[PDB]
Structure 1
């Protein structure tokens, strides 16, 4: 988190189909998103589908959800920031 630049939030991205499917269940459908948007929408999606909770030792549990299929893990810590960006980057392309 400390070594992640604030400029990351401005990266412009095109979600691959499965990630786009998830995003469209929580936000406006667009072709190009910022990473700020993707993180916000994923966070709301997680909360909405109860994949994360108080006192779960900061773990998101996604094995019963399409998110698990996108990310290819059954669970992950919200504290593992660089791993989160890697799992996200597998499901989008950067637009420049």
Structure 2
């Protein structure tokens, strides 16, 4: 699998949910992002596919006020703008 190196702000976010490393697979990045979204309760309680991220680090990184977990290609792109491959 492709190994990626999150930029400093994304890495800070990942490590806040127990990520240990400086290089990751995209699946690991998505896993830790999910953990962040879950533990901070950023998902809509009625519509769990909706993530709210205005005035959160996640929003500043992704460049959106909210997104749907179903927007896979977009999420991949939003994550990728915070990476570099290694």
Fold match, TM over 0.5?
yes
Deviation of the 1:64 alpha carbon: 2.6
Count of residue pairs the alignment pairs up: 86
Structure 1 residues without counterparts, runs of 5 or longer: 1-9
Question: Structure 2 length as normaliser, TM-score?
Answer: 0.93
Please, which moves more after superposition, 65-74 or 21-30? 21-30
Please, which moves more after superposition, 39-48 or 20-29? 20-29
Please, which moves more after superposition, 50-59 or 17-26? 50-59
Question: Structure 1 length as normaliser, TM-score?
Answer: 0.83
Q: What value does the CA root-mean-square deviation take over the aligned residues? A: 1.2
Structure with the greater alpha carbon radius of gyration: 1
Runs of at least 4 residues off by over 6 Å: none
C-alpha distance in 1 between matches for 2:10 and 2:53? 14
Q: Secondary structure at the match of 2:44?
A: coil
Structure 2 residues without counterparts, runs of 5 or longer: none
C-alpha distance in 1 between matches for 2:20 and 2:27? 15
